[PDB]
Amino acid sequence: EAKFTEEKILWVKHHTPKLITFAISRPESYRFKAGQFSRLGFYEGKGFIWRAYSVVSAEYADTLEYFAVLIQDGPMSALFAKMQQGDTILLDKNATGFLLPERFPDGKDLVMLCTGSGIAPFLSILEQPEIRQRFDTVNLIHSVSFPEELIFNDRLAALSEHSFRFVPVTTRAANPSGLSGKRIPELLKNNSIEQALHTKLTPESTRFMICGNPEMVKDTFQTLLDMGYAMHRNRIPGQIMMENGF
Ligand SMILES: Cc1cc2nc3c(=O)[nH]c(=O)nc-3n(C[C@H](O)[C@H](O)[C@H](O)COP(=O)(O)OP(=O)(O)OC[C@H]3O[C@@H](n4cnc5c(N)ncnc54)[C@H](O)[C@@H]3O)c2cc1C
Ligand SMILES: NC(=O)c1ccc[n+]([C@@H]2O[C@H](COP(=O)([O-])OP(=O)(O)OC[C@H]3O[C@@H](n4cnc5c(N)ncnc54)[C@H](OP(=O)(O)O)[C@@H]3O)[C@@H](O)[C@H]2O)c1
């Protein structure tokens, strides 16, 4: 039939005036791999409006959960800001994306680097039991401007205490637990991330995922290349995978 189904908003949590999570009903035949994104839409008059969102919830969960930054004057943000439980929302029948760490042949330490809402796919990746089994450590570095935007801080930090480490980065204000004042590319360059994790990072043992602001992705990729890392390819195992968070 159609390329999408009509689902319902099950709930909406307004963590801050600009940051929301929400959940939608999940058709039994909707399958995705941790790290992928859905396309969500609404009827817009006689037409549609569609956007991509990384699935935050686990592959095995019975709902679909998402995490959205409300963009000033954004068309989809405007709908998200007024949507309520019970509203109809459209779910494209197909999930997409290549942020798939199991494609890495080996590696001792998985390091996921994200900004803002780009944390979303890594939250779903964190639920896959085999990811934790194949990596000696799994690390998540999350960069936001202010600590109030670290909305998953409480539980990620609870999961950190085969090890899992969470390092918050706040670029425009201090945060006690993690790194403050500096963006991820510089924190890779000056050894701060390597020191924060207590794990030496090398091309031989470290595998990188990057998701977030496109300028951050380019800057991080360039920094890693200068440090001897390589892009994962169809025929080269490599040590870097990346996806623009928007
Ligand atoms: C593969 C992919 C995955 C995505 N996953 C998510 C997700 O999990 N969560 C999410 O919030 N958005 C996600 N986005 C972006 C999302 O699809 C929309 O762009 C976003 O919801 C804003 O839509 P809008 O209509 O309100 O404004 P738009 O017209 O779509 O965007 C206006 C501008 O706002 C900025 N912007 C848009 N989205 C973001 C963002 N999330 N963070 C920072 N700046 C942004 C950009 O400069 C953009 O040009 C993803 C985009 C892609 C391509
Ligand atoms: N949050 C911001 O600082 C900021 C700035 C300009 C516009 N906006 C707008 O505000 C809305 C919300 O955005 P957001 O804060 O969720 O997303 P964001 O602008 O992408 O910021 C999230 C994180 O990404 C970092 N970052 C940005 N560019 C980077 C780069 N080139 N290299 C490395 N790290 C980089 C930011 O550092 P910094 O804090 O140092 O930028 C911040 O830590 C969007 O409409 C966005 O366009 C936000």
Phi, psi of 223 (to 5 degrees): -60, -45
Which CATH number applies to 1-96? Answer: 2.40.30.10
d(CA 153, CA 159): 10
213 marked among binding-site residues: yes
| Substitution candidate for ligand 1 out of 15, 66, 71, 117 with most atoms within 8 A of CB | 71
Sheet (strand 163-170) strand order: 179-180, 163-170, 137-144, 109-115, 206-212, 240-244
Residue 196 burial (CB count, 10 A): 18
Contact between residue 135 and residue 207 where contact means Cβ atoms under 8 Å apart? yes
CATH fold label, 97-246 = Rossmann fold (3.40.50)
177 marked among binding-site residues: no
Contact between residue 69 and residue 96 where contact means Cβ atoms under 8 Å apart? no
112 marked among binding-site residues: no
d(CA 207, CA 98): 15
d(CA 170, CA 161): 21
Phi, psi of 11 (to 5 degrees): -165, 160
Resolution in A: 2.5
| 41 DSSP β-pair partners | 50, 90
| Substitution candidate for ligand 2 out of 76, 152, 213 with most atoms within 8 A of CB | 213
Which bin fits 107, alpha (ψ -120 to 50), beta or left (φ > 0)? left
N-terminal to C-terminal alpha carbon distance within the chain: 29
d(CA 142, CA 119): 7
One-letter amino acid at 54 equals S
Can you give the residue ranges of every domain in the chain? 1-96, 97-246
Contact between residue 147 and residue 157 where contact means Cβ atoms under 8 Å apart? no
Atom of ligand 1 nearest to the CA of 71: 26
b/e per residue, 63-102, with b = 16+ CB within 10 A?
A: ebbbbbbbeeeeebbebbbebeeeeebbbbeebebebbbe
CA distances from 72 to 18, 54, 75, 81, 141 (A): 9, 20, 9, 11, 26
Phi, psi of 68 (to 5 degrees): -125, 135
d(CA 219, CA 227): 12
* DSSP-derived secondary structure letter, 181: S
Atom of ligand 2 nearest to the CA of 18: 12
> Experimental technique used?
X-ray
d(CA 118, CA 42): 23
The set of long-range contacts for 81-87, using a CB threshold of 8 Å and a minimum separation of 24, is 81/20, 83/9, 83/12, 83/22, 84/9, 84/12, 85/8, 85/9, 85/10, 85/11, 85/12, 86/8, 86/9, 87/8, 87/9
Q: What are the residue ranges of helices labelled H in 16-72?
A: none
Q: What are the residue ranges of helices labelled H in the chain?
A: 75-82, 120-125, 129-134, 153-160, 184-189, 192-197, 214-226
Q: Cα 231 vs. chain centroid, distance in angstroms?
A: 19
